[PDB]
Amino acid sequence: VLLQRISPLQIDPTIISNTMSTVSESTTQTLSPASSILGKLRPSNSDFS
């Protein structure tokens, strides 16, 4: 918590979402690489301790 108050670095997870929304793929495929990676990570509104 001491590092949090003085560090100027901010973790904004929307960066991943924006870049993953422009991946070209077909909608008739059983598997989607873009959606799966979002499913695995999924950390928002947390503390990042």
Add this chain to the structure above:
Amino acid sequence: TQSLVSSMRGTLDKLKLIKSMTPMYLQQLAPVELAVIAPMLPFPPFQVP
């Protein structure tokens, strides 16, 4: 994906061959209009090369 690549090529070609009359207007007729208007301005033109 291969479908997107062909679609992008088609879109770019039709942008190249658009039937817009502006670029010719800016070369042959636009300077004439400015020349006619210029002597009638309250504030005469002030230019640098």
